[PDB]
Design a protein around this ligand. Structure first.
Ligand SMILES: NS(=O)(=O)c1cc(NC(=O)Nc2ccc(C(F)(F)F)cc2)c(O)c([N+](=O)[O-])c1
Ligand SMILES: [Zn+2]
Length: 257
């Protein structure tokens, strides 16, 4: 099946998922001079004080931290959104070197990694229903640059040894996702898609202007993970990012001037 290798990577995905060539695919390059300031955009409202993380999983493409979404515990609202979206998981995309790794780019600049906080629209009742709707998901995207260590990330870094290979999971309770946010919540927004198969075009993307810093050692630990399962030949989990797609008939809006 699909992956990020030479014979199954993003240039091949359209054969099994023809929407790979659709009208609102992600990620995109954010051209900061042609993005449009929109004064009618509201501030983001991030309410993560009651978040309940459950576990961390190596799913063979990235690693996911999953949360309890049976109730409105950790929600996102405001910004360009109408309604309440519940946090279900977060994951990252990263590179084999510091110069690449993010999925979105800013004026063609790539960052070392990108954090994706996935939320789904509660009016649709469950995540499976929400992904079938043009306004079903809202994903908060955060860039990582290499520099100073990010203290709030270290707990994630320390458990990666226990989920080295595909299909492994570990108990991961009491993790506070507020530790991953930058200082400012200024953002760009556009309508887009999932960036992995099935590539459904169900996402309101909210991409924060301000990156967070992580240390060289922290991102090094990311690139020790394994695409393969235990007992298979080792393939390091690196460069699990999809390249920028054509913007086509879309406009990037900015919350800031
Ligand atoms: N980069 S991203 O788009 O934000 C992104 C999304 C997911 N998760 C899913 O896509 N789940 C899912 C989607 C549809 C169905 C359905 F509807 F088919 F059942 C079932 C499950 C993910 O695991 C990663 N990742 O890399 O770990 C990245
Ligand atoms: Zn993602």
């Amino acid at each position: 099946h699909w992956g990020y290798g030479k014979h199954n990577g993003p240039e091949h995905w359209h054969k099994d998922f023809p929407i790979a060539k659709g009208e609102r695919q992600s990620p995109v390059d954010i051209d900061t001079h042609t993005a449009k300031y929109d004064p009618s955009l509201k501030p983001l409202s991030v309410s993560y004080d009651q978040a309940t993380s459950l576990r961390i999983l190596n799913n063979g493409h990235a690693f996911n931290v999953e949360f309890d979404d049976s109730q409105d515990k950790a929600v996102l609202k405001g910004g360009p959104l109408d309604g309440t979206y519940r946090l279900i998981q977060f994951h990252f995309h990263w590179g084999s070197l510091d110069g690449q790794g993010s999925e979105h780019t800013v004026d063609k600049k790539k960052y070392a990694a990108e954090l994706h906080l996935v939320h789904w629209n509660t009016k649709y009742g469950d995540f499976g229903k929400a992904v079938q709707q043009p306004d079903g998901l809202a994903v908060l995207g955060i860039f990582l640059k290499v520099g100073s260590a990010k203290p709030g990330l270290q707990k994630v870094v320390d458990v990666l040894d226990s989920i080295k290979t595909k299909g492994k999971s570990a108990d991961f309770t009491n993790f506070d996702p507020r530790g991953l946010l930058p200082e400012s919540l200024d953002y760009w927004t556009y309508p887009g898609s999932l960036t992995t198969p099935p590539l459904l075009e169900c996402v309101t993307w909210i991409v924060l202007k301000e990156p967070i810093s992580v240390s060289s050692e922290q991102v090094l630990k990311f690139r020790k993970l394994n695409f393969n399962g235990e007992g298979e030949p080792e393939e390091l989990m690196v460069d699990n990012w999809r390249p920028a797609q054509p913007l086509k008939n879309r406009q990037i809006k900015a919350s800031f001037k």
